[PDB]
Amino acid sequence: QDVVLGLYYMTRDCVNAKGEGMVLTGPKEAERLYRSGLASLHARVKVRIT
Amino acid sequence: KPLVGTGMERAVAVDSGVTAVAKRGGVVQYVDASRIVIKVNEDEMYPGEAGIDIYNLTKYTRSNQNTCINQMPCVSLGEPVERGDVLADGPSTDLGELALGQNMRVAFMPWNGYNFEDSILVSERVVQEDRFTTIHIQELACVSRDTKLGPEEITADIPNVGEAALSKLDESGIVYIGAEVTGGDILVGKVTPKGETQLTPEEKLLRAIFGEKASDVKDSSLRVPNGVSGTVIDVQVFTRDGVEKDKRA
Amino acid sequence: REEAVVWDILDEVIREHPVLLNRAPTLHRLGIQAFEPVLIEGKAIQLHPLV
Amino acid sequence: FLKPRLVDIEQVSSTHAKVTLEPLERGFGHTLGNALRRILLSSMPGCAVTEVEIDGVLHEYSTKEGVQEDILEILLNLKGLAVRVQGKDEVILTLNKSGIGPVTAADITHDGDVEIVKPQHVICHLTDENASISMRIKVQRGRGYVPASTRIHSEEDERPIGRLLVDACYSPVERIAYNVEAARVEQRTDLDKLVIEMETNGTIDPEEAIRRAATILAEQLEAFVDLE
Amino acid sequence: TEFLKPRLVDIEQVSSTHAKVTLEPLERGFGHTLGNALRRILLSSMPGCAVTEVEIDGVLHEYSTKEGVQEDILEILLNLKGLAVRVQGKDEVILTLNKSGIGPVTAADITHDGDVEIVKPQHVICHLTDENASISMRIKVQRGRGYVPASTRLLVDACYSPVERIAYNVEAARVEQRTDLDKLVIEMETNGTIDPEEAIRRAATILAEQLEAFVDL
Amino acid sequence: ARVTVQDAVEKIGNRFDLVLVAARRARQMQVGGKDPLVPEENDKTTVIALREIEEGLINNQILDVRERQEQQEQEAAEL
Amino acid sequence: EIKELLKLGDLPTSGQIRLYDGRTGEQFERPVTVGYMYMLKLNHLVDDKM
């Protein structure tokens, strides 16, 4: 119950947030952007994943 | 004092039997934890048997579910009281209301999973304030019968214990009032007579080597149950008439 | 007497020794499961949430 | 790069004070705010009542003549007693009082080392005009929160059964709240300004508190850093 | 008086550039303190050089394309955002590329400077198809702090600090006599320009210099 | 440590013969007839037995060969 | 009436304050419900059960 709520809040998208539509080199700077507060937790973003 | 009450709290507080309701109002003459002494007004007073009212409060005593039913005065010295007005709050009562628990600041949020299914998570600010620290009273009992091997004794001398285990006892073998005991301490030193040990081989060899008499008695003393603490607050000694009463009795 | 030397001994005897946890309506066979104990300052069995 | 420095301390009313801390860079406002908030709020040196010995009392589940209180509400009124100690780490105060009326902390006996920060903190009321209460309070410097169930291991031979162990809440602080707002600087555009509002019981002055807290924090970091 | 401090224990380098550092004797609640403090100082405010300016020989303005390059210039600069460069004893340097033929343009092909080190010479920049287009560019990086675009400064958008991830866990640690205490676990990934122990060391140096003024012994 | 026993299931199948083989091996290591053939990490004889299964050097067949070899050495050590 | 009583206090009308985490020190997104609930200690204490 708590874990699925944490996921459903974590993986979603609102149409306007911080860092809307920026580009990311991977998951690591996704974490550095969220935990610094520059970009929001959910904003649609092109990333590079392997 | 429940901040969100329903107004039915005063009827349950007064009209139960735990609090002390004034039967004749007046001016409060004397306030103590033991008793409350009321000077009755002139108009509410009978012509014969004049007097004043006295209300003996019930102090720390045992309830049936091992909790501590207690009464505490809520009125001060020299205060006007109405007829039918509360004077002594009982257990879980504040000022003649019904205070079953306590009111606390609550946040509804999932906090790192510690509130997973239905769990509650409490700060140390509650336990430092002792605002949920409750008082229980247990009643341990030690009976002393008459077996057909001999009668039992309540003497302080116990076989094969230390003096540090017996320093919390008196000269009569019954524990002092107000000594904090833990699990395993001896409250009532009681020994039962036994005989016919039926010792084995090499145990009988050892006895022969060291000459130690296997004693004619057995430690069946009353002990604290495994894993509690607390204070001895009240000791009673019931004795059959025709038997020597010891010193603490 | 619970002297201070027995807690290292107890941590030696726990380390890889599974205990069985059981809830009373044991309907299907996942009602009894083993675990490895981690010792707790407390009096309540801590039980993993996903289980 | 640019290091901070403390500036005006504002005792607001009596016992809670706003400590400003002006020259802080990006991010270090919230950083030092959270860090100093925690170290002030958790572990500061303070002293509280540990052992109480009332004269005519066997144990805390009892009653006394003339006192309208029970014994353990006297003990819970002594737990909230805010006191400070200058040149000792434990010291024994005492109460001797007679007559009808309130009994506050102002009636505790005189000592040059011990300062009482609230003379109106009411301990117990007396009624019968003859029932004189007389106790010996033992205050003790400490750290954090130690309940009475933890101290009783060696037990100090508690055979003087008149000793009543009180849970000692040694923490002198009650609430620490910080704001981080921008300080207008001459050439540099943004430098954050920290304001640590601190509510205490009255025993600890704020500059010494924050100096102890930053000392403890730097002592924690100097495990793998060094002197500078 | 129980102010017992920790001591560093085995910095476990897992493979190349990222290390797990545990720290066993900490009091109640200091684990999240040191974790949050070191975390925010590493992740937010480090002295660190990132990609400042990258000037290709045959590109006039940054909206262009090159012979043989399968991409356009913008996703190439997006690739260059992850370029990890260390500067040892300079405050300014200009290196250069020279790549000919069909193949990927690596960071190995950047010119040799004995001080400025590219920790990954395999760092792919763009690909080539022509075999007649000899790509060559000149790169200057310049030191900064945090995240700054070109809006305050071909001009290249960037990200300064050498750390890639800092994550801590606080978990209970039994002590021989003591009841229960915290244990700090900092797992940290850097880009390789700074070895991780020096990264945590500079973080603690910055924090202690911040606490230098009003704390004293 | 040993969180899952999956590798020992891949070496010795049937998931139930694994218990009997590891039991026999851990009795050979607890009752002091033998000593471990893998470095122990302060594990109990259970986990050491499972780790000796996962290294492949113990199964039912190797234990039978080793036990018959000990019996032959007893027959040679009768004198 | 609860809203009009909250307007007598300085509290927000929606009854949800923004809160700051004790550890990270940074604001929770989506301000949360705090209040004063009257709670009870039931006598299923653990040391009688264990």
Side-chain angles (χ1 to χ4, degrees), chain D residues 2-4 6 25-26 28 30-32 34 38-39 143 210-211 214-221 223-224, chain E residues 2-3 5-6 8 27 29 32-34 36 40-41 145 200-201 204 206-207 209-214:
Chain D
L2 194 147
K3 63 177 72 175
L6 64 90
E25 292 176 350
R26 290 181 184 271
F28 288 166
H30 294 287
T31 300
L32 300 183
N34 194 7
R38 179 174 287 173
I39 292 177
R143 185 178 184 271
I210 297 173
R211 190 176 298 274
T215 300
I216 291 172
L217 208 161
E219 186 180 2
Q220 291 293 321
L221 266 80
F224 59 92
Chain E
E2 61 271 15
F3 297 104
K5 65 177 71 175
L8 61 92
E27 297 180 356
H32 296 283
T33 299
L34 302 186
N36 191 8
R40 189 171 296 171
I41 294 177
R145 187 168 180 265
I200 297 170
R201 186 177 300 276
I206 288 173
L207 199 158
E209 186 177 1
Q210 295 291 312
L211 270 70
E212 184 181 2
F214 61 96

Short mmCIF file of all heavy atoms in Angstrom, two decimals, chain D residues 1-4 6 25-26 28 30-32 34 38-39 143 210-211 214-221 223-224, chain E residues 2-3 5-6 8 27 29 32-34 36 40-41 145 200-201 204 206-207 209-216, unseen atoms left out:
data_model
loop_
_atom_site.label_atom_id
_atom_site.label_comp_id
_atom_site.label_asym_id
_atom_site.label_seq_id
_atom_site.Cartn_x
_atom_site.Cartn_y
_atom_site.Cartn_z
N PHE D 1 32.80 29.35 -0.39
CA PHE D 1 33.98 30.20 -0.33
C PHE D 1 33.90 31.18 0.84
O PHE D 1 34.66 31.07 1.80
CB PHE D 1 34.17 30.97 -1.63
N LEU D 2 32.97 32.13 0.75
CA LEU D 2 32.85 33.15 1.79
C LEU D 2 32.22 32.54 3.03
O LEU D 2 31.11 32.00 2.98
CB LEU D 2 32.02 34.32 1.27
CG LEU D 2 32.00 35.65 2.04
CD1 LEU D 2 31.87 36.79 1.06
CD2 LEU D 2 30.85 35.72 3.02
N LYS D 3 32.92 32.64 4.16
CA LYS D 3 32.52 32.01 5.40
C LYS D 3 31.58 32.92 6.19
O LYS D 3 31.64 34.14 6.03
CB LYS D 3 33.76 31.64 6.22
CG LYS D 3 34.60 32.82 6.66
CD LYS D 3 35.76 32.36 7.53
CE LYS D 3 36.82 31.65 6.70
NZ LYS D 3 38.01 31.30 7.53
N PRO D 4 30.70 32.37 7.04
CA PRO D 4 29.76 33.22 7.78
C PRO D 4 30.37 33.85 9.02
O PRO D 4 31.57 33.70 9.28
CB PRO D 4 28.64 32.26 8.17
CG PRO D 4 29.32 30.97 8.31
CD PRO D 4 30.38 30.94 7.26
N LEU D 6 28.53 35.50 12.99
CA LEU D 6 27.26 35.77 13.65
C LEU D 6 27.09 37.26 13.90
O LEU D 6 28.06 38.01 14.07
CB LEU D 6 27.12 34.97 14.95
CG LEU D 6 28.00 35.13 16.18
CD1 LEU D 6 27.47 36.17 17.16
CD2 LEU D 6 28.11 33.79 16.86
N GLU D 25 26.25 31.51 1.79
CA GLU D 25 26.20 31.38 0.34
C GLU D 25 24.96 30.60 -0.09
O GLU D 25 24.01 30.43 0.69
CB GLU D 25 27.48 30.72 -0.16
CG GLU D 25 28.69 31.60 0.01
CD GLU D 25 29.97 30.91 -0.40
OE1 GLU D 25 29.95 29.68 -0.64
OE2 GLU D 25 31.00 31.60 -0.49
N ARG D 26 24.93 30.17 -1.35
CA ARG D 26 23.85 29.33 -1.84
C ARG D 26 23.82 28.00 -1.10
O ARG D 26 24.86 27.38 -0.88
CB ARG D 26 24.01 29.05 -3.33
CG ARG D 26 23.78 30.21 -4.27
CD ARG D 26 23.97 29.72 -5.71
NE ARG D 26 23.84 30.79 -6.69
CZ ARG D 26 22.70 31.16 -7.25
NH1 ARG D 26 21.57 30.54 -6.93
NH2 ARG D 26 22.68 32.14 -8.14
N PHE D 28 23.85 26.86 1.80
CA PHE D 28 24.33 26.67 3.16
C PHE D 28 23.36 27.23 4.19
O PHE D 28 23.48 26.89 5.37
CB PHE D 28 25.70 27.31 3.36
CG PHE D 28 26.81 26.57 2.68
CD1 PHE D 28 28.04 27.17 2.52
CD2 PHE D 28 26.64 25.29 2.21
CE1 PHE D 28 29.07 26.51 1.89
CE2 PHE D 28 27.66 24.63 1.58
CZ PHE D 28 28.88 25.23 1.43
N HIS D 30 19.94 26.61 4.23
CA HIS D 30 19.14 25.45 4.61
C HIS D 30 19.99 24.35 5.23
O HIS D 30 19.52 23.65 6.14
CB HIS D 30 18.39 24.90 3.40
CG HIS D 30 17.36 25.82 2.85
ND1 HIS D 30 16.16 26.05 3.49
CD2 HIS D 30 17.33 26.56 1.72
CE1 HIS D 30 15.44 26.90 2.78
NE2 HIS D 30 16.13 27.22 1.69
N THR D 31 21.24 24.22 4.80
CA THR D 31 22.15 23.20 5.31
C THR D 31 22.46 23.41 6.78
O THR D 31 22.19 22.53 7.61
CB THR D 31 23.45 23.21 4.54
OG1 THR D 31 23.19 22.96 3.16
CG2 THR D 31 24.37 22.15 5.07
N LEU D 32 23.01 24.58 7.11
CA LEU D 32 23.32 24.87 8.49
C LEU D 32 22.06 25.05 9.32
O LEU D 32 22.08 24.80 10.52
CB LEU D 32 24.20 26.11 8.60
CG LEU D 32 25.53 26.01 7.87
CD1 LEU D 32 26.34 27.26 8.09
CD2 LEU D 32 26.29 24.78 8.31
N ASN D 34 19.21 23.15 9.01
CA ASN D 34 18.80 21.81 9.42
C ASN D 34 19.80 21.21 10.40
O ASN D 34 19.41 20.60 11.41
CB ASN D 34 18.65 20.90 8.21
CG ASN D 34 17.92 19.62 8.54
OD1 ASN D 34 17.41 19.45 9.64
ND2 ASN D 34 17.89 18.70 7.59
N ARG D 38 18.98 20.45 14.36
CA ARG D 38 19.00 19.13 14.95
C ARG D 38 19.94 19.05 16.15
O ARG D 38 19.57 18.52 17.20
CB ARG D 38 19.37 18.09 13.92
CG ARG D 38 19.41 16.77 14.58
CD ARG D 38 19.62 15.66 13.69
NE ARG D 38 18.47 15.35 12.88
CZ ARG D 38 18.53 14.45 11.92
NH1 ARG D 38 19.68 13.83 11.71
NH2 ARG D 38 17.47 14.17 11.20
N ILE D 39 21.14 19.62 16.04
CA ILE D 39 22.10 19.44 17.12
C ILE D 39 21.74 20.29 18.34
O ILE D 39 21.96 19.87 19.48
CB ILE D 39 23.52 19.67 16.59
CG1 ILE D 39 23.82 18.53 15.64
CG2 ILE D 39 24.56 19.66 17.68
CD1 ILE D 39 25.11 18.63 14.98
N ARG D 143 22.60 14.99 29.57
CA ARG D 143 22.62 15.10 28.12
C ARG D 143 21.58 14.17 27.53
O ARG D 143 21.67 12.95 27.70
CB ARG D 143 24.02 14.74 27.61
CG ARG D 143 24.28 14.91 26.14
CD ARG D 143 25.73 14.54 25.90
NE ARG D 143 26.17 14.73 24.53
CZ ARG D 143 26.07 13.81 23.58
NH1 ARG D 143 25.53 12.63 23.86
NH2 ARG D 143 26.50 14.06 22.36
N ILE D 210 24.65 27.77 20.38
CA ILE D 210 25.00 27.56 18.99
C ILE D 210 26.50 27.30 18.85
O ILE D 210 26.93 26.53 17.98
CB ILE D 210 24.53 28.76 18.14
CG1 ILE D 210 23.01 28.82 18.21
CG2 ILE D 210 24.93 28.64 16.69
CD1 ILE D 210 22.44 30.02 17.57
N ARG D 211 27.30 27.87 19.75
CA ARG D 211 28.73 27.60 19.74
C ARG D 211 29.01 26.15 20.14
O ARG D 211 29.84 25.48 19.51
CB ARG D 211 29.45 28.58 20.65
CG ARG D 211 30.95 28.54 20.54
CD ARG D 211 31.57 29.60 21.42
NE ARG D 211 31.15 30.94 20.99
CZ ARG D 211 31.76 31.64 20.04
NH1 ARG D 211 32.82 31.15 19.43
NH2 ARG D 211 31.31 32.84 19.72
N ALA D 214 27.79 23.94 16.99
CA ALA D 214 28.76 23.94 15.90
C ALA D 214 30.06 23.28 16.31
O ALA D 214 30.73 22.67 15.47
CB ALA D 214 29.00 25.36 15.43
N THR D 215 30.42 23.35 17.59
CA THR D 215 31.59 22.64 18.09
C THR D 215 31.41 21.14 17.98
O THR D 215 32.31 20.43 17.51
CB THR D 215 31.86 23.05 19.54
OG1 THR D 215 32.10 24.46 19.60
CG2 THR D 215 33.07 22.32 20.09
N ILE D 216 30.23 20.64 18.37
CA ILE D 216 29.95 19.20 18.29
C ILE D 216 29.92 18.75 16.84
O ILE D 216 30.45 17.68 16.50
CB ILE D 216 28.63 18.87 19.02
CG1 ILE D 216 28.81 19.05 20.52
CG2 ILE D 216 28.18 17.46 18.76
CD1 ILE D 216 27.53 18.93 21.29
N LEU D 217 29.38 19.58 15.95
CA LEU D 217 29.30 19.21 14.54
C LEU D 217 30.69 19.16 13.91
O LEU D 217 31.01 18.22 13.15
CB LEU D 217 28.41 20.21 13.81
CG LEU D 217 27.64 19.80 12.56
CD1 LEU D 217 26.53 20.79 12.34
CD2 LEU D 217 28.45 19.69 11.34
N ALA D 218 31.53 20.15 14.20
CA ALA D 218 32.89 20.15 13.67
C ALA D 218 33.72 19.02 14.27
O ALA D 218 34.60 18.47 13.61
CB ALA D 218 33.56 21.50 13.93
N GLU D 219 33.43 18.65 15.52
CA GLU D 219 34.12 17.52 16.13
C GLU D 219 33.70 16.22 15.48
O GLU D 219 34.50 15.28 15.38
CB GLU D 219 33.83 17.49 17.64
CG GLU D 219 34.62 16.44 18.41
CD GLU D 219 34.31 16.46 19.89
OE1 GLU D 219 33.46 17.26 20.32
OE2 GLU D 219 34.92 15.66 20.63
N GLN D 220 32.45 16.14 15.01
CA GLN D 220 32.03 14.97 14.26
C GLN D 220 32.71 14.90 12.90
O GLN D 220 33.13 13.83 12.46
CB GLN D 220 30.51 14.95 14.09
CG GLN D 220 29.75 14.72 15.37
CD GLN D 220 29.97 13.34 15.92
OE1 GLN D 220 30.04 12.37 15.18
NE2 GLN D 220 30.09 13.24 17.24
N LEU D 221 32.84 16.04 12.22
CA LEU D 221 33.50 16.01 10.91
C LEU D 221 35.01 15.87 10.99
O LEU D 221 35.64 15.46 10.01
CB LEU D 221 33.21 17.26 10.09
CG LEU D 221 32.04 17.12 9.14
CD1 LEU D 221 30.76 17.27 9.85
CD2 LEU D 221 32.16 18.14 8.06
N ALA D 223 36.75 13.71 12.29
CA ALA D 223 37.16 12.31 12.31
C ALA D 223 38.02 11.97 11.10
O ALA D 223 38.93 11.15 11.20
CB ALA D 223 35.94 11.40 12.36
N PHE D 224 37.73 12.58 9.95
CA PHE D 224 38.53 12.36 8.76
C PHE D 224 39.03 13.65 8.12
O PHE D 224 39.80 13.59 7.15
CB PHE D 224 37.75 11.51 7.74
CG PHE D 224 36.45 12.11 7.29
CD1 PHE D 224 36.40 12.91 6.17
CD2 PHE D 224 35.28 11.84 7.97
CE1 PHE D 224 35.21 13.44 5.75
CE2 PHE D 224 34.08 12.38 7.55
CZ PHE D 224 34.05 13.18 6.44
N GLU E 2 29.48 12.00 27.00
CA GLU E 2 29.53 10.80 26.18
C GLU E 2 29.67 11.11 24.68
O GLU E 2 29.07 10.42 23.84
CB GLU E 2 28.29 9.93 26.46
CG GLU E 2 26.92 10.55 26.16
CD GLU E 2 26.32 11.32 27.33
OE1 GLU E 2 27.05 11.64 28.29
OE2 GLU E 2 25.11 11.60 27.28
N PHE E 3 30.53 12.06 24.32
CA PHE E 3 30.54 12.70 23.01
C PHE E 3 31.20 11.87 21.91
O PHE E 3 31.69 12.44 20.94
CB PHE E 3 31.25 14.04 23.08
CG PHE E 3 30.58 15.04 23.97
CD1 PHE E 3 31.10 15.32 25.23
CD2 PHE E 3 29.45 15.73 23.55
CE1 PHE E 3 30.49 16.25 26.06
CE2 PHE E 3 28.84 16.66 24.38
CZ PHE E 3 29.36 16.92 25.63
N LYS E 5 32.95 9.98 19.12
CA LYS E 5 33.02 10.28 17.69
C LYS E 5 33.33 9.00 16.91
O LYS E 5 33.81 8.03 17.49
CB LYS E 5 34.10 11.34 17.45
CG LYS E 5 35.50 10.89 17.79
CD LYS E 5 36.49 11.97 17.45
CE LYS E 5 36.37 13.13 18.41
NZ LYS E 5 37.43 14.15 18.17
N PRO E 6 33.04 8.96 15.60
CA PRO E 6 33.43 7.78 14.82
C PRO E 6 34.87 7.82 14.36
O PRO E 6 35.63 8.73 14.68
CB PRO E 6 32.49 7.83 13.62
CG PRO E 6 32.25 9.27 13.44
CD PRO E 6 32.19 9.86 14.81
N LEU E 8 36.93 6.55 10.47
CA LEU E 8 36.74 5.98 9.14
C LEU E 8 37.12 4.51 9.13
O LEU E 8 38.10 4.09 9.76
CB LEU E 8 37.55 6.77 8.11
CG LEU E 8 39.09 6.88 8.17
CD1 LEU E 8 39.83 5.79 7.38
CD2 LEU E 8 39.56 8.26 7.73
N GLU E 27 26.24 8.74 17.15
CA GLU E 27 25.18 8.84 18.15
C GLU E 27 23.80 8.86 17.47
O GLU E 27 23.68 8.72 16.25
CB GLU E 27 25.39 10.08 19.01
CG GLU E 27 26.67 10.05 19.81
CD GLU E 27 26.84 11.30 20.64
OE1 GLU E 27 25.99 12.21 20.54
OE2 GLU E 27 27.84 11.39 21.39
N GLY E 29 20.87 9.96 15.60
CA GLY E 29 20.43 11.02 14.72
C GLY E 29 21.53 11.79 14.02
O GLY E 29 21.22 12.60 13.14
N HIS E 32 21.84 10.99 9.83
CA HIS E 32 21.14 11.77 8.82
C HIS E 32 21.69 13.19 8.73
O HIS E 32 21.66 13.78 7.65
CB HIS E 32 19.65 11.82 9.12
CG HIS E 32 18.98 10.49 9.05
ND1 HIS E 32 18.67 9.87 7.86
CD2 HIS E 32 18.53 9.67 10.03
CE1 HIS E 32 18.06 8.72 8.12
NE2 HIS E 32 17.97 8.57 9.42
N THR E 33 22.24 13.73 9.82
CA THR E 33 22.90 15.03 9.81
C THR E 33 24.09 15.03 8.88
O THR E 33 24.17 15.85 7.96
CB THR E 33 23.40 15.43 11.19
OG1 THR E 33 22.30 15.52 12.08
CG2 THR E 33 24.09 16.77 11.13
N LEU E 34 25.03 14.11 9.14
CA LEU E 34 26.25 14.08 8.34
C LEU E 34 25.94 13.68 6.91
O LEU E 34 26.55 14.22 5.98
CB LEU E 34 27.27 13.13 8.95
CG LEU E 34 27.68 13.46 10.38
CD1 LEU E 34 28.79 12.56 10.86
CD2 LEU E 34 28.05 14.91 10.53
N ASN E 36 23.02 14.28 5.15
CA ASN E 36 22.41 15.42 4.47
C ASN E 36 23.41 16.53 4.24
O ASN E 36 23.43 17.14 3.16
CB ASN E 36 21.23 15.94 5.29
CG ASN E 36 20.39 16.95 4.53
OD1 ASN E 36 20.57 17.18 3.34
ND2 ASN E 36 19.49 17.60 5.25
N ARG E 40 24.51 17.50 0.52
CA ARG E 40 24.12 18.73 -0.14
C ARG E 40 25.34 19.56 -0.52
O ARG E 40 25.33 20.24 -1.55
CB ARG E 40 23.16 19.53 0.75
CG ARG E 40 22.55 20.72 0.06
CD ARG E 40 21.47 21.33 0.89
NE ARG E 40 20.36 20.41 1.06
CZ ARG E 40 19.35 20.61 1.88
NH1 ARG E 40 19.30 21.72 2.61
NH2 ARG E 40 18.38 19.71 1.98
N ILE E 41 26.42 19.46 0.26
CA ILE E 41 27.62 20.21 -0.11
C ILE E 41 28.29 19.59 -1.32
O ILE E 41 28.74 20.31 -2.22
CB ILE E 41 28.56 20.32 1.09
CG1 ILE E 41 27.90 21.16 2.16
CG2 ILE E 41 29.88 20.95 0.72
CD1 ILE E 41 28.69 21.28 3.40
N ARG E 145 30.72 26.27 -10.51
CA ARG E 145 30.17 25.85 -9.23
C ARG E 145 28.65 25.69 -9.33
O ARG E 145 27.94 26.68 -9.49
CB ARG E 145 30.57 26.90 -8.19
CG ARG E 145 30.27 26.65 -6.75
CD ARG E 145 31.07 27.70 -5.98
NE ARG E 145 30.91 27.64 -4.54
CZ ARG E 145 30.04 28.38 -3.86
NH1 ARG E 145 29.27 29.25 -4.50
NH2 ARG E 145 29.96 28.26 -2.54
N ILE E 200 35.02 13.55 -0.60
CA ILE E 200 34.44 13.67 0.75
C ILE E 200 35.33 14.54 1.63
O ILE E 200 34.84 15.31 2.47
CB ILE E 200 34.22 12.27 1.35
CG1 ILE E 200 33.21 11.50 0.51
CG2 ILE E 200 33.62 12.34 2.72
CD1 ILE E 200 33.10 10.06 0.89
N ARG E 201 36.65 14.48 1.40
CA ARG E 201 37.58 15.28 2.18
C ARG E 201 37.40 16.77 1.91
O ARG E 201 37.38 17.58 2.84
CB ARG E 201 39.01 14.85 1.86
CG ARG E 201 40.07 15.50 2.71
CD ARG E 201 41.43 14.94 2.35
NE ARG E 201 41.46 13.50 2.58
CZ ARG E 201 41.71 12.93 3.76
NH1 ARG E 201 41.95 13.69 4.82
NH2 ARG E 201 41.72 11.61 3.87
N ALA E 204 34.15 17.94 3.62
CA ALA E 204 34.32 18.20 5.04
C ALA E 204 35.17 19.44 5.28
O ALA E 204 34.93 20.16 6.26
CB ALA E 204 34.96 17.00 5.72
N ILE E 206 35.19 22.12 3.33
CA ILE E 206 34.30 23.25 3.07
C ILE E 206 33.35 23.47 4.24
O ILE E 206 33.17 24.60 4.71
CB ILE E 206 33.55 23.06 1.75
CG1 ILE E 206 34.52 23.24 0.58
CG2 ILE E 206 32.40 24.04 1.61
CD1 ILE E 206 33.93 22.90 -0.75
N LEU E 207 32.80 22.38 4.79
CA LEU E 207 31.87 22.52 5.91
C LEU E 207 32.58 23.04 7.16
O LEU E 207 32.04 23.87 7.90
CB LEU E 207 31.18 21.19 6.21
CG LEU E 207 29.88 21.14 7.02
CD1 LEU E 207 29.14 19.87 6.72
CD2 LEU E 207 30.09 21.21 8.50
N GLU E 209 35.30 24.86 7.22
CA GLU E 209 35.65 26.26 6.99
C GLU E 209 34.43 27.15 7.15
O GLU E 209 34.54 28.31 7.58
CB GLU E 209 36.27 26.41 5.60
CG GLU E 209 36.81 27.80 5.29
CD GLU E 209 37.48 27.87 3.94
OE1 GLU E 209 37.51 26.85 3.23
OE2 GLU E 209 37.99 28.96 3.58
N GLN E 210 33.24 26.63 6.82
CA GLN E 210 32.01 27.36 7.15
C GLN E 210 31.79 27.43 8.65
O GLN E 210 31.28 28.42 9.16
CB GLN E 210 30.81 26.70 6.47
CG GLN E 210 30.86 26.78 4.98
CD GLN E 210 30.68 28.17 4.45
OE1 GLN E 210 29.76 28.88 4.85
NE2 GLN E 210 31.56 28.58 3.55
N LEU E 211 32.18 26.39 9.37
CA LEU E 211 32.03 26.42 10.82
C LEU E 211 33.28 26.92 11.53
O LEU E 211 33.37 26.81 12.75
CB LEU E 211 31.64 25.05 11.35
CG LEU E 211 30.15 24.70 11.47
CD1 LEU E 211 29.52 24.55 10.12
CD2 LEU E 211 30.00 23.42 12.26
N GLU E 212 34.25 27.44 10.78
CA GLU E 212 35.49 27.92 11.36
C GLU E 212 35.29 29.16 12.23
O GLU E 212 35.95 29.28 13.26
CB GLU E 212 36.50 28.24 10.25
CG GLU E 212 37.89 28.65 10.73
CD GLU E 212 38.84 28.97 9.58
OE1 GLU E 212 38.40 28.91 8.42
OE2 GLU E 212 40.01 29.29 9.85
N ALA E 213 34.38 30.05 11.84
CA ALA E 213 34.32 31.39 12.42
C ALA E 213 33.78 31.41 13.84
O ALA E 213 34.42 31.95 14.74
CB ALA E 213 33.48 32.30 11.53
N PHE E 214 32.59 30.85 14.05
CA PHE E 214 31.90 31.01 15.31
C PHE E 214 31.98 29.78 16.21
O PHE E 214 31.59 29.85 17.37
CB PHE E 214 30.44 31.42 15.07
CG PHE E 214 29.64 30.42 14.30
CD1 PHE E 214 28.84 29.51 14.95
CD2 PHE E 214 29.62 30.45 12.92
CE1 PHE E 214 28.08 28.62 14.25
CE2 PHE E 214 28.86 29.55 12.21
CZ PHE E 214 28.09 28.63 12.87
N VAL E 215 32.47 28.66 15.70
CA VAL E 215 32.87 27.57 16.58
C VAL E 215 34.35 27.69 16.90
O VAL E 215 35.15 28.17 16.09
CB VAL E 215 32.57 26.22 15.94
N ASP E 216 34.72 27.24 18.09
CA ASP E 216 36.11 27.26 18.51
C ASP E 216 36.33 26.17 19.54
O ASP E 216 35.38 25.63 20.11
CB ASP E 216 36.52 28.63 19.07
#
